[PDB]
Design a binder for this molecule. Structure first.
Ligand SMILES: Cc1ncc(NC(=O)NCc2ccccc2C(F)(F)F)c(-c2ccccc2)n1
Length: 296
């Protein structure tokens, strides 16, 4: 549902092939469970199961989302296995990502906090690895002409081997409620990640995702701090619209902060493409230690 363009295709899983283990999360739209899934890939494997709470308007929303998610298969997008529509509750089956959402992972590996990561805070090399993978997922979505309306580290997942993919199970507005500004009745906007053209003109395009990615880049180098944490929602809105930019994080080298600033050009057309932002981050991520050691 977070995607916006700028039933036979859907894979089905028998309810007996899904064995719920325990709850992983809960939101306003449903629950997430860890489950054992049989004969999904050639004997048994762990999966995250999103259960839809309750309804005919929601059943068609579920069907369209499943169709969209089926089309969306890539190396840096959380894997969607299919649905279970034989009875209630309707289920969506996704791969299980061991380390949870990227915001939680960053926070637990920051100075304020070991199979996949070294002790202490994440090094420059791993922060750039994380950033490059998120950018790679955005390059793919932009390439399919899809806009992600809620790009943030809370909406990315981390798996075994520090593999980072875009995806979430729809509970961010519940788990990370302070990351949203409540408006017109029930609507909640991720204002701190939104560019000036979204706040002012209610426009959200591929260039608006480059801006949101720059905020994601800032979250990474601050180990998951909330952008504009010192400010209330209206003060954050004033900053974004008046052109005040987030400051260079302590752990962020000037070369990386240059990439962030390039994402935050006021005019959408002046922002670099996500393809270029990715290219610059991957070049830094795979750069020899000798080079990276003289950056920061
Ligand atoms: C109410 C509500 N708000 C937000 C949601 N989150 C999204 O749409 N996230 C996008 C997403 C999710 C899973 C995998 C991949 C992606 C994407 F598009 F980035 F490639 C969902 C959601 C509805 C279906 C499946 C799960 C999440 N539901």
């Amino acid at each position: 549902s977070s995607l916006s363009p700028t039933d036979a295709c859907v894979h089905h899983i028998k309810r007996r092939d899904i064995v719920l283990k325990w709850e992983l999360g809960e939101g306003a739209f449903g629950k997430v469970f860890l489950a054992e899934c049989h004969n999904l890939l050639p004997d048994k494997m762990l999966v995250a199961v999103k259960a839809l709470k309750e309804s005919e308007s929601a059943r068609q929303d579920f069907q369209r989302e499943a169709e969209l998610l089926t089309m969306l298969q890539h190396q840096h997008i959380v894997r969607f296995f299919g649905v279970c529509t034989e009875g209630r509750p309707l289920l969506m089956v996704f791969e299980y990502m061991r380390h949870g959402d990227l915001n939680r992972f960053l926070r637990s590996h920051g100075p304020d906090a070991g199979e996949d990561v070294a002790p202490g805070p994440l090094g420059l090399g791993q922060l750039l690895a994380v950033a490059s993978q998120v950018a790679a997922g955005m390059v793919y979505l932009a390439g399919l002409h899809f806009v992600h309306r809620d790009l943030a580290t809370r909406n990315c997942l981390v798996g075994q081997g520090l593999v980072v993919k875009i995806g979430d199970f729809g509970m961010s507005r519940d788990i990370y409620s302070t990351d949203y500004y409540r408006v017109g009745g029930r609507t909640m906007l991720p204002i701190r990640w939104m560019p000036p053209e979204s706040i002012l003109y209610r426009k959200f395009t591929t260039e608006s995702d480059v801006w949101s990615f720059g905020v994601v880049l800032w979250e990474i180098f601050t180990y998951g701090k909330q952008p504009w944490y010192q400010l209330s929602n209206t003060e954050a809105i004033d900053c974004i619209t008046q052109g005040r930019e987030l400051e260079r994080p302590r752990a962020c080298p000037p070369e990386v902060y240059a990439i962030m600033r390039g994402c935050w050009q006021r005019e959408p057309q002046q922002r670099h493409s996500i393809k270029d932002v990715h290219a610059r981050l991957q070049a830094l991520a795979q750069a020899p230690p000798v080079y990276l050691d003289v950056l920061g």
